[PDB]
Design a protein around this nucleic acid. Structure first.
Lengths: 176, 135, 48, 120, 108, 63
RNA sequence: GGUCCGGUAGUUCAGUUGGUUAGAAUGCCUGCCUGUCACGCAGGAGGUCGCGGGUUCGAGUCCCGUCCGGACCGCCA
RNA sequence: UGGUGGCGAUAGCGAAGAGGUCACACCCGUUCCCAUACCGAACACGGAAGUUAAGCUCUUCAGCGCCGAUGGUAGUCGGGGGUUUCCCCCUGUGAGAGUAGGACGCCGCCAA
RNA sequence: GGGGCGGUCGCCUCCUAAAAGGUAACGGAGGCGCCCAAAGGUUCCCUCAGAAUGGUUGGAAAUCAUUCGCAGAGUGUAAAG
RNA sequence: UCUGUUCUCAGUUCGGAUCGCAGUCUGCAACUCGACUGCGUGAAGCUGGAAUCGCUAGUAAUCGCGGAUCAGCAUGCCGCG
């Protein structure tokens, strides 16, 4: 919200001038911020996913969906039909409300921090985070936490190449 | 001794031979080649013997090309048995060679020695042959 | 295993339909709604 | 950018799916709908000869409203196309949603046609 | 909490703060003495200003996120300098200098 | 949204120990972040002022 | 030449059926015991399943072929 | 220019370039209809801030894909020979991977 | 392709099969003696397998995000359509 | 040892091993190869299988204190309470 208004006011004009897009609305934009959860279950502990779901709901703004595994694999003893992982999508005002928490408090609150992954990009503007702890905002009832597994986080943009997204994330406020 | 490392079936019809070869009728990789002017079968032992008769004589002169593969197996019932009651086991691989097919080709070697060496090897094959060279 | 069964009804005793079923999957006495001929309408058919 | 398929492109597949089952013959023509962002179109089509019979639209040259695309416009255009069928009266048609979902302005149009008396 | 890590919430302050990798008993007692925190209090009941003004002091000393990496690059220096001390570190045998014949079991 | 399943989400003010204020919405209502983006060492542009960092390889016997 | 069996720790046999776990004696190793050895008492490691191919989420244990041996038959003039 | 049909992709895929007052489409926000096995991108909902960027519509091209007889042959119906697992002659018949080239659209009906 | 012994005896898929159908052999390859209260009926909506790249616990593969991708994937099971 | 304050049963304020940093002493000399000290660190260990040892009261069990060896080097030995 705050960020978004700022996105309308300062970010889009600045980088539109910096790249010379003839059409203004061609400017890159964050499309979605999506969360994935994965629990080594195959089932290892049936309560693991049944805990991760309603901790991730607090972490995000709304309930996730339990991911239905695609195909069976005996390497992990993962039979097809035993649920693993959970997903929640975020967009609209919610994605900016989420990025707000992240950039302002979460990354600086990591057990240790330096500049985020230098070349985590995929190649076409998408970009991913691997954060190991659930310490995202400090008011989680953090004493509840038994397992320490953090989040897999993907930010998806309308960028067509890595350079523009790299530049955009700067004034969005991500360190590198 | 060219084994096909695998095959879809280990038994199939003997088939028939009619007309010229479908492809590979002229030299394509070597300076000179050898051609067969009637239809017949050709087996691992034949190609192996001819190959050795070629290369061991030619020594360091160059390289020899083989355009043949005995993908076809052929069966034979066990010795001393009444015929019938199931196709016999397979014990050899064979390559169909219609007339016009060029079998072997030589590269990087003088003309006369290739001529006489191909003549030498031809006696290993059971088939009337004709010397042939690239256009 | 699949075992034969004949269907029955409470609206009227006369019932005729047959079917197959798995004991493991349906241990309970199953119900279907079907057209009884002699009652000349649709009714709820149990099994015997 | 993220490969977003055209909305009309997605709609065309559904429209072809539904069209596969039915079409409007002589004395049993087919109604059709376009649910454009800014306008609503209606058409009475005879498949076999490949020509329309009568049509109606929000941007028709009379009876306009500031809606021109909302449910009120759908009702008005529906009764309009009902009259446009009436003068060369057909009295029956096979409905065919334009690969849409029968809940909204399409329902308003269908209700208008029915109450006007085009027996589906 | 105190510096990127937790602390037990129901222990005396002097002992409890020692849990962060980088300060032991003596360092903790001297720094809490400099702070004036009474040297004995369950960390549950303490005030916000005193918390904050004990944060900055320990931040201006090196703590786990930096000492861990620094000790590692120090042993790295010993490793690739080619020292005898370095190769003992590499192989995992005692480095301070001990008779490896009999005990030597604290390592390996 | 399907009413009820999601937790109550609402405006949630943010207060850091430095006093920095931020206009957030959250499942919660008030959060006490100890250190914020305006304070954390790497986050201070480049260690502007939240720092204690010196590094040398030295060799000095002159006393 | 045909039909049927099997092939597992270094040796001998279970499992080999339970498709989703490799086990029991002996041997071997360390220690104790004895003056020494042997018994004996504590502990411990092992094979990853004759070979190759295939089905299956998963093969030791299912189906094929190859090697190995073992059982039976190979008769009428 | 939109809508909606028939035609074998000679209509496709690519590479470039033009358009938008109107039409279309992106867009704006979920207030109530409806919905996201999580969500207003998607479903629907009610507007019209700005944009031809994309879609869509037009101009160009043989790079790919596609279509394509002419004479050849291989095969082959029916006759006739031969030293006959296979070859050859005569009346026809006629392969396809190859080029001659066609093509980067043609026909409609309702609304401009 | 004498008997005995061995093997087989019904049904389903393909090739042998000679561009309709049919067509044998102790000819060449497989399967069936079920299963499914939904794996049926209907309305409505989409779209695959594999690969590359980023992502931790987590690799060759678990679960994510982008792109390519006429069908390689699926279709209860054995082959063909 | 006695007195008093805290700790409240944990691999813990037990245990202190091993480690990097910074020093002191002696000796020409402390890398192989001393001891001691300030930091940081904090390991295994939560009463030890089969077996086995010393001890008849100032003994065993604990607690320290000296001394030969000699610049420094003692958990050993000798002796004392």
């Amino acid at each position: 919200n705050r960020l978004k208004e700022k996105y309308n006011k300062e970010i889009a004009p600045a980088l539109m001038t910096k790249f010379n897009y003839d059409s203004v609305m061609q400017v890159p934009k964050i499309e979605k911020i999506v969360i994935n959860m994965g629990v080594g279950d195959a089932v290892q502990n049936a309560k693991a996913i049944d805990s991760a779901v309603e901790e991730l709901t607090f972490i995000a703004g709304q309930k996730p969906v339990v991911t239905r595994a695609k195909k069976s694999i005996a390497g992990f003893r993962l039979r097809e039909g035993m649920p693993i992982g959970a997903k929640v999508t975020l967009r609209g005002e919610r994605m900016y409300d989420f990025l707000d928490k992240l950039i302002s408090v979460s990354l600086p609150r990591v057990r240790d921090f330096r500049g985020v992954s230098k070349k985590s990009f995929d190649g076409r503007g998408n970009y991913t985070l691997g954060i190991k702890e659930q310490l995202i905002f400090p008011e989680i009832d953090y004493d509840k936490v038994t397992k320490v597994r953090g989040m897999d986080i993907v930010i998806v943009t309308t960028a067509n190449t890595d350079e523009e997204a790299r530049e955009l994330l700067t004034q969005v406020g991500m360190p590198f | 001794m060219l084994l096909p490392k695998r095959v879809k079936y280990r038994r199939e019809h003997r088939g028939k031979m009619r007309g010229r070869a479908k492809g590979g009728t002229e030299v394509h990789f070597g300076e000179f080649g050898i051609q067969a002017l009637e239809a017949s079968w050709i087996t691992n032992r034949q190609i192996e013997a001819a190959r050795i008769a070629m290369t061991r004589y030619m020594k360091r002169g160059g390289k020899v090309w083989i355009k043949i593969f005995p993908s076809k197996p052929y069966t034979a019932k066990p010795l001393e048995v009444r015929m019938g009651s199931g196709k016999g086991a397979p014990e050899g691989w064979v390559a169909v060679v219609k007339p016009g097919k060029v079998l072997f080709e030589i590269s990087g070697v003088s003309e006369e020695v290739a001529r006489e060496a191909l003549r030498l090897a031809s006696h290993k094959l059971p088939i009337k042959t004709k010397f042939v060279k690239r256009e | 295993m699949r075992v034969n069964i004949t269907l029955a009804c409470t609206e009227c005793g006369e019932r005729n339909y047959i079917s197959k079923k798995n004991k493991r999957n349906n241990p309970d006495r199953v119900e279907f709604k079907k057209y009884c001929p002699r009652d000349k309408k649709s009714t709820l058919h149990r099994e015997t | 950018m993220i490969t977003k398929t055209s909305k009309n492109a997605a709609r065309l597949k559904r429209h072809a799916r539904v069209r596969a089952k039915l079409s409007g013959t002589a004395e049993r023509p087919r109604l059709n709908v376009f649910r454009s962002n800014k306008h609503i179109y209606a058409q009475i089509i005879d498949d076999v000869n490949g020509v329309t019979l009568a049509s109606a639209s929000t941007l028709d040259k009379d009876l306009n409203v500031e809606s021109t695309g909302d449910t009120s416009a759908a009702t008005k255009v529906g009764e309009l196309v009902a009259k446009r069928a009436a003068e060369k009266g057909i009295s029956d048609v096979v409905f065919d949603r334009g690969g849409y979902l029968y809940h909204g302005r399409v329902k308003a149009l269908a209700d208008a046609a029915r109450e006007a008396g085009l027996k589906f | 909490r105190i510096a990127g890590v937790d602390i037990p919430r129901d222990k005396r302050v002097v002992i409890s703060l020692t849990y962060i990798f980088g300060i032991g008993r003596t360092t903790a007692q001297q720094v809490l003495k400099e702070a004036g925190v009474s040297e004995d209090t369950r960390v549950r009941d303490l005030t916000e200003e005193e918390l904050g003004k004990i944060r900055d002091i320990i931040d201006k000393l090196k703590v786990e996120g930096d000492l861990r990496r620094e000790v590692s690059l120090n042993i790295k220096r010993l490793i690739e300098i080619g020292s005898y001390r370095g190769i003992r570190h590499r192989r995992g045998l005692p480095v301070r200098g001990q008779n490896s014949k009999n005990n030597a079991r604290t390592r390996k | 949204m399907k009413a009820g399943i999601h937790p109550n989400f609402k405006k949630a003010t943010v207060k850091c120990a430095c006093g920095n204020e931020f206009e957030t919405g959250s499942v919660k209502e008030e959060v006490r972040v100890e250190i914020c983006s305006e304070c954390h060492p790497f986050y201070t542009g480049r260690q502007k002022f939240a720092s204690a960092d010196g590094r040398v390889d030295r060799f000095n016997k002159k006393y």
